[PDB]
């Protein structure tokens with residue numbers, strides 16, 4: 001039993017809800033919140049910009065030190081950093097950005113990072129400003145993640161469409 005509330009159950013382990021991931025994380029304070037990151041951890045817009053603003057830019061400060069030490073992530077890769085005031089840990093995961101020409105096949109690799117954590121609050125990777133089809137992002141998530149994932153979908157039109165089209 002965990003403290004996630006109001007989710008629709010899609011499969012044995014994947015749940016989905018219409019919610020702002022920032023407000024969800026502040027309420028639940030999960031062990032792991034997933035960020036929709038880029039390889040430079042420049043948290044400018046989308047989910048990443050929203051999560052960072054909620055930390056008063058502390059996420060960006062920590063991220064810049066991480067990059068200065070380790071260099072950029074790989075597309076499809078991830079790193080674990082602090083969850084600041086939002087969660088115990090933030091898993092920064094790089095889904096492909098279709099608007100940069102990145103291979104959509106790397107989306108499965110991105111979701112595989114979730115399997116290293118027993119429970120996560122997460123967005124749909126590569127959705128939104130990353131330019132991939134959110135219906136596709138959901139299918140890959142369901143077919144790749146085996147740990148317990150609670151998906152926060154920002155757009156009502158998307159959320160209702162995601163639910164009504166789910167196979």
Ligand SMILES: OC[C@@H]1CC2(CCC2)CN1c1ncnc2[nH]ccc12
Nearest residue numbers: 021046047050123124127128129154
């Ligand atoms: O697939 C990620 C989706 C796609 C997006 C562009 C249209 C809606 C942003 N995003 C979010 N998902 C959950 N919580 C969020 N909080 C702030 C942004 C955000």
